[PDB]
Amino acid sequence: GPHMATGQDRVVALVDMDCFFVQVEQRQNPHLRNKPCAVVQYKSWKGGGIIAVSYEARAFGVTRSMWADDAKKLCPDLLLAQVRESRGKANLTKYREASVEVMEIMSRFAVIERASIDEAYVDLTSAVQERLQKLQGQPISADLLPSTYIEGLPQGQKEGMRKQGLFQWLDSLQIDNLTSPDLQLTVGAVIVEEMRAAIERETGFQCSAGISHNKVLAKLACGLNKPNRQTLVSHGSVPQLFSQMPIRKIRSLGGKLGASVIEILGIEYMGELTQFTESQLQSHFGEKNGSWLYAMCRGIEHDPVKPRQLPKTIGCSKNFPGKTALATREQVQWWLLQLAQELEERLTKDRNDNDRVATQLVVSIRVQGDKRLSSLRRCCALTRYDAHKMSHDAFTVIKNCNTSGTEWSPPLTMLFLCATKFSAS
DNA sequence: ATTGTGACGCT
DNA sequence: AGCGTCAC
Ligand SMILES: Nc1ncnc2c1ncn2[C@H]1C[C@H](O)[C@@H](COP(=O)(O)OP(=O)(O)OP(=O)(O)O)O1
Numbered sequence: 530g531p532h533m534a535t536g537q538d539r540v541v542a543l544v545d546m547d548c549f550f551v552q553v554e555q556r557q558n559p560h561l562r563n564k565p566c567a568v569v570q571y572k573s574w575k576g577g578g579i580i581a582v583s584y585e586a587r588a589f590g591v592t593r594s595m596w597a598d599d600a601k602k603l604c605p606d607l608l609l610a611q612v613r614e615s616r617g618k619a620n621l622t623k624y625r626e627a628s629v630e631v632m633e634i635m636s637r638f639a640v641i642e643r644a645s646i647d648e649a650y651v652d653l654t655s656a657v658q659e660r661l662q663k664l665q666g667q668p669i670s671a672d673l674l675p676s677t678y679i680e681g682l683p684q685g686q687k688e689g690m691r692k693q694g695l696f697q698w699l700d701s702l703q704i705d706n707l708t709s710p711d712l713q714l715t716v717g718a719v720i721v722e723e724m725r726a727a728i729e730r731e732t733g734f735q736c737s738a739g740i741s742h743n744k745v746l747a748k749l750a751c752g753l754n755k756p757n758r759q760t761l762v763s764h765g766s767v768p769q770l771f772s773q774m775p776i777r778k779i780r781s782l783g784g785k786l787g788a789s790v791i792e793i794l795g796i797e798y799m800g801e802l803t804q805f806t807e808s809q810l811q812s813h814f815g816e817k818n819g820s821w822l823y824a825m826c827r828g829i830e831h832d833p834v835k836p837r838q839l840p841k842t843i844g845c846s847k848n849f850p851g852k853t854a855l856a857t858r859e860q861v862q863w864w865l866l867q868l869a870q871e872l873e874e875r876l877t878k879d880r881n882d883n884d885r886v887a888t889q890l891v892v893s894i895r896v897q898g899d900k901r902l903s904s905l906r907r908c909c910a911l912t913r914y915d916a917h918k919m920s921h922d923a924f925t926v927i928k929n930c931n932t933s934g935t936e937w938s939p940p941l942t943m944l945f946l947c948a949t950k951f952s953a954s
Numbered sequence: 955a956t957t958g959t960g961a962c963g964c965t
Numbered sequence: 966a967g968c969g970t971c972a973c
């Protein structure tokens with residue numbers, strides 16, 4: 530009743546750069562704009578691996594993690610841009626720098642949590658209060674929400690329906706109540722329209738966004754209307770929305786845990802979780818997961834938007850699949866050097882830009898025929914930004930994995946160097 | 955022969 | 966600490 534908290538205390542947005550690496554390449558090369566096109570890493574094995582796909586190309590069935598030769602079968606006019614190669618591996622610097630452009634604009638409007646290179650959560654609660662007090666009672670015009678969908682409306686041409694739903698929502702709004710969660714979300718959506726307009730004006734990049742009361746709903750909302758649109762998911766919209774939502778679509782339930790929720794409880798949709806007590810869910814999935822599931826099938830989640838615009842780790846990884854697996858000492862040392870040199874370059878830039886120094890080096894490897902994605906993960910001290918020293922230390926840390934009697938066996942299928950544990954500098 | 959990231963939880 | 970999960 531009156532004491533049941535409804536998770537309506539915050540306004541949270543999730544901003545997601547539409548096919549980001551593709552947009553970066555389309556900005557640089559106008560011949561790629563408004564065409565079916567994709568970004569690929571490497572080129573020899575089956576044309577290279579596709580890692581990003583424009584919406585025009587998605588219409589032909591082109592997806593990430595598909596070989597370029599196969600994508601060309603689906604879409605023979607597909608245009609491709611290749612990731613830069615430096616020191617023998619893919620180098621994502623162009624995309625990291627573009628991401629910083631976007632994140633810096635978002636940070637003007639509100640505090641952000643960098644979730645990935647192309648995704649950030651936005652805490653809008655204080656921004657909405659400020660904008661509400663600046664309104665002082667006037668309603669919100671549809672003209673302030675030109676790309677917003679209201680999930681679940683209209684009820685009772687795609688752009689025509691978008692506007693019908695928005696009109697239903699806005700006519701229903703009680704603007705006089707400065708504490709109405711639905712009003713707060715709507716003002717959040719106005720601010721996100723402005724943020725998205727600023728991103729596009731100042732970078733050329735388009736994005737989609739979700740606006741709701743927490744991060745999981747904001748992420749779910751963001752996915753409902755792409756590309757270049759934003760979606761408001763109100764608390765009231767959750768029962769219908771969840772009633773036919775596959776559990777795997779909710780952030781963190783797309784893996785083994787979600788599969789076990791489905792198998793153990795015999796359900797398919799998020800909304801079905803409401804039938805179970807909190808103790809029942811904790812009994813199947815643990816105290817933390819159980820309480821989380823109990824609240825989140827009701828639209829409630831408390832995970833904060835962390836004030837963190839920079840990555841916490843700086844990592845350099847390369848797979849050596851099939852017959853490219855590393856089999857000699859000279860090879861392992863040469864690739865550790867290559868990785869360590871990219872890492873030193875990025876670390877020196879990070880120290881200059883962000884006033885911090887990493888203090889721990891994580892070295893990880895995969896060994897041929899090992900079922901796990903990482904076979905070994907050991908850490909050593911990171912005391913100066915020197916590629917030769919880091920590569921020597923990584924070798925020293927992994928060298929007892931060699932079971933030979935100048936050869937390396939079993940062959941190595943992945944090397945990974947990661948700088949972690951930053952401290953202010 | 956999805957690769958190259960990056961965040962967080964468990965024990 | 967090292968390993969596992971999840972997503973991007
Ligand atoms: N597995 C991956 N390997 C390499 N890069 C990836 C991988 N997954 C995603 N990315 C890269 C390419 C994307 O441009 C960028 C953002 O990822 P993601 O948001 O999932 O898709 P996207 O931005 O390309 O399209 P959209 O969000 O519009 O559906 O990160």
Ligand SMILES: [Ca+2]
Pocket residue numbers: 545546547548549647
């Ligand atoms: Ca994206």
Ligand SMILES: [K+]
Pocket residue numbers: 545546645647648973
């Ligand atoms: K993303």
